[PDB]
């Protein structure tokens, strides 16, 4: 196979070879012809253990004729072994390149039959398509669109199948047309990649995560695909950074750094906007600063981390605390940021809050109302957000008192009164402080 050296590929090949059907037995059961049985036996002796060569067509015909699951698994295992073998496999790939019917038959066999047989056939098809002459974007797209490939990729329990699928996609990503096909497949099944990234952030799993990161980086190599994937998941960069920080593997960290840089690379559209959004939301600058302080054995990974840190510092140089506050308000997430407890920041941002008919004050009132609606859950993060919103409302009432009337009109006083009866002690104290700042002493 193309990536038969992987543990998942070896396990799939062993599973396929476990269900083996003899060519003579298939011929006896009218599942193959005598010449087809002889060709299948020759191929089995050559690969599973003489090369069939031109006889591989009779073996494929016998496999198609033998609809039994065991026979299909044996044929897939023989094909995978031939692809792994140096003498064999290459001849089959050349024949498929010369005759598109053979390539079409191999593509149809891929992701078909038994799960082990489907995996072996897909690996054989990927190995055949590895050659430039036999490469076909349409065949790769058809194999990806198969339900078996999607099930293998989404098989959380079957980590080996997902790792094999990710490795096959990464290998196919070299060809630009196959790279576009892999990008389309990623756009279709981004949920599997997101789940893999979340599992890595929170062995077979490590290899699958590394393959997924490599495929993501290969897709992001194209600026259009990177720009499209940037808006697909705003938290993808944060998840990748968390996985890189958690993972100690140099290769995985380097791949994550390259993927993060590709999204913020100048080639991708809205590079400055994407970098600013990443720094404001995922705290790219602090993570990059922490990574720079940490020592990495790999020189390439260290250089990538240094470049990412420089890019984050350049992006944060233009940004200010006001941009961070605006991003936090837009994301409706507040965890007692330094600006909330900074008297100078509130004093210098009081006019900005009341600007545009107190647009920031209205947004804060809406966030407080949403937290009050979400106050039934009374989660720790929700309680912290509610307390931060109450503190911000108290500050915007103490300074620029004109906003107090707007808050009262928008139900801010009612929200504060409702929060005064909250079970949480901190929320009740914050609401009492806001009420005291409103009309109290």
């Amino acid at each position: 196979k193309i990536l038969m050296d992987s543990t998942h590929f070896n396990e799939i090949r062993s599973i396929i070879r476990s269900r083996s059907v003899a060519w003579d037995a298939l011929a006896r059961s009218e599942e193959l012809s005598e010449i087809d049985a002889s060709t299948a036996k020759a191929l089995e002796s050559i690969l599973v253990k003489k090369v069939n060569g031109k006889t591989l067509i009779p073996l494929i015909h016998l496999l198609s004729t033998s609809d039994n699951e065991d026979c299909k698994k044996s044929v897939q295992n023989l094909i995978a072994e031939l692809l792994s073998s140096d003498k064999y496999g290459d001849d089959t790939v050349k024949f498929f390149q010369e005759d598109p019917k053979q390539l079409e038959q191999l593509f149809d066999v891929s992701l078909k039959g038994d799960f082990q047989t489907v995996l072996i056939s897909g690996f054989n098809v990927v190995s055949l398509l590895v050659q430039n002459g036999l490469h076909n974007v349409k065949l790769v797209e058809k194999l990806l669109k198969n339900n078996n490939l999607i099930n293998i990729l989404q098989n959380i329990e079957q980590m080996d199948t997902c790792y094999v699928c990710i490795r096959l996609l990464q290998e196919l990503a070299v060809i630009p047309e196959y790279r576009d096909v892999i990008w389309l497949h990623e756009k279709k099944f981004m949920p599997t990649l997101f789940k893999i990234l979340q599992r890595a952030t929170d062995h077979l799993g490590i290899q699958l995560q590394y393959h997924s990161l490599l495929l993501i980086w290969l897709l992001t190599f194209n600026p259009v695909f990177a720009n499209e994937l940037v808006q697909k998941y705003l938290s993808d960069f944060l998840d990748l950074l968390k996985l890189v920080k958690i993972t100690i593997k140099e290769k995985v960290s380097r791949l994550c750094i390259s993927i993060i840089l590709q999204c913020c690379s100048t080639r991708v559209k809205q590079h400055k906007k994407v970098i600013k959004q990443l720094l404001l939301l995922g705290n790219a600058l602090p993570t990059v600063q922490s990574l720079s302080e940490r020592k990495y054995s790999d020189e390439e990974l260290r250089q990538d981390i240094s470049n990412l840190k420089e890019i984050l510092e350049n992006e944060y140089q233009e940004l200010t605390s006001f941009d961070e506050y605006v991003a936090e308000l837009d994301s409706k997430l507040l965890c007692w940021s330094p600006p909330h407890v900074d008297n100078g920041f509130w004093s210098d941002n009081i006019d900005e809050f009341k600007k545009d008919n107190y647009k920031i004050f209205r947004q804060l009132i809406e966030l407080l109302q949403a937290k009050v609606r979400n106050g039934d859950v009374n989660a720790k993060q929700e309680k912290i957000i509610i307390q931060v919103a109450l503190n911000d409302i108290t500050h915007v009432v103490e300074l620029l008192p004109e906003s107090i009337d707007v808050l009262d009109k928008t139900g801010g006083k009612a929200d504060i009164m409702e929060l005064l009866n909250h079970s949480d002690s901190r929320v009740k104290y914050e609401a009492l402080k806001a009420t005291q700042a409103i009309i109290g002493y």
């Binding site: 050296d5 070299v174 630009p176 190599f221 080639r267």
Partner: protein, 33 residues
């Protein structure tokens, strides 16, 4: 075969650099046109 895979991965990076060179062709083409 582990060393060959690293060279092949680096060879893929050479193709990516060549693709980057092909990207500069678009900028050069607009000036000639």
């Amino acid at each position: 075969e582990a060393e060959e895979k690293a060279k092949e991965i680096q060879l893929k990076a050479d193709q990516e650099y060549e693709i980057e060179k092909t990207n500069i062709v678009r900028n050069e083409t607009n000036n000639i046109d």
